[PDB]
Design a protein around this ligand. Structure first.
Ligand SMILES: O=c1ccn([C@@H]2O[C@H](CO)[C@@H](O)[C@H]2O)c(=O)[nH]1
Ligand SMILES: O=c1ccn([C@@H]2O[C@H](CO)[C@@H](O)[C@H]2O)c(=O)[nH]1
Ligand SMILES: O=c1ccn([C@@H]2O[C@H](CO)[C@@H](O)[C@H]2O)c(=O)[nH]1
Lengths: 71, 73, 72, 74, 72, 73, 71
């Protein structure tokens, strides 16, 4: 298929997003686009196992993503 | 289905926190934005892992610098 | 053979992907695209040539990739 | 219920501004112009590293790429 | 007198591909495209004189390449 | 598109260029182009304010530039 | 008065290429393109001032160039 297809197959389901530099985000994938900018709902920022803050929602720049996976 | 830029829009005039590469944060009112994700914040504060470094009437942030944007309160 | 061509010749077969900084993955190449983003089913993250974890599947930003090679 | 990023930049032509470059340094000068890329031109400006003035220049042309943020300095 | 041309005049011949970071690859140039992505057959990964891997073939993102040269 | 104009107003006049990282150049601006690649004549590589080496001319990649500023002195 | 024109005025002549990261290249400029990719003939990879390697020729990714100079 197309990687963007699998992304769409994950809408409304939980996911794990990895970022350059080390940090991770966990939550519900709401939307996305050709830049791979992502939108998460009810998410936690994670650094080396420990949470570093919760957020009602976030908009991440695709240019910061390494990979995304379902949980 | 809901898209990134859309959510930004749904947040114009309200307060937001902008993360940046390196670690410096910003808190202010999202005034505007363009397609390359540049941002415009009014009455914002630069945040150094905790404390406040500077306060500005307004600020024009390069999109290429942002890591994420989150609605505050 | 075109770079993108050789990749296609591997759809469904196992592969190893190496990202900038070390992180290596091992799984089935499900799909790809222009930019070179990749989708991998049933795969394991491997920085140190061993096994560090597993993930039903993953979508990788082509920007992150260094190389892709068929896992004999 | 207005703006755009490039607009606010225009709304500062001829006024003093603070420019934050990637790395750490900064520039303080009169915003003379800009463009799509977001390249900037500054007049009678100073380079500043962690507080100290490192050099004064008649004017400077800053590659958009280098910029982190621009703000009007009141 | 055309970087990509030189690359072409080496298909099927042995080459040295230097990546960013320090690592290297020695193998047979198979394919290539506009971006400068490469395809190598029967290659070995090299880090400061030592072989860290042998592979049937590899697809290298142009983005990673520092340089490519022929080896008699 | 005014920055590119300023560069033009300096063609043949001396200038100082700074590249991402730290290296600085001083010489006569000869040419330039959309991308911001530059051509300098009789230039010198610099640190701490003065001379460190010389080159009849150099072609810098716009991708490497941080800033250019006209400088007789 | 155009960068790419100066390169061309150096075809078949010795040049020095400085790449990000530190290392340099010395050799005869053979070719180049819009991406400023370069081709060198009979070149040496110099590091910290020591000849670190000789090659019959190299194709240097433009993206890795800092600057090119004659003589
Ligand atoms: O003179 C130029 C040419 C390009 N760019 C911008 O720099 C980036 C490429 O490094 C692109 O966003 C491009 O728009 C500039 O800032 N100035
Ligand atoms: O010869 C070139 C080609 C591109 N670029 C710049 O590098 C950016 C991305 O590498 C391009 O958008 C362009 O602004 C250069 O500096 N020199
Ligand atoms: O074969 C290629 C393809 C792209 N680039 C340039 O390298 C940069 C990659 O970020 C971009 O400016 C692009 O124009 C090259 O140097 N060579």
């Amino acid at each position: 298929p197309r990687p963007l297809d699998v992304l769409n197959r994950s809408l409304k389901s939980p996911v794990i997003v990895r970022l350059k530099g080390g940090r991770e985000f966990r939550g519900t994938l709401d939307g996305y686009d050709i830049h791979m900018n992502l939108v998460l709902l009810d998410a936690e920022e994670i650094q080396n196992g420990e949470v570093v803050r919760k957020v009602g929602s976030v908009v991440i720049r695709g240019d910061t993503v390494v990979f995304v996976s379902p949980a």
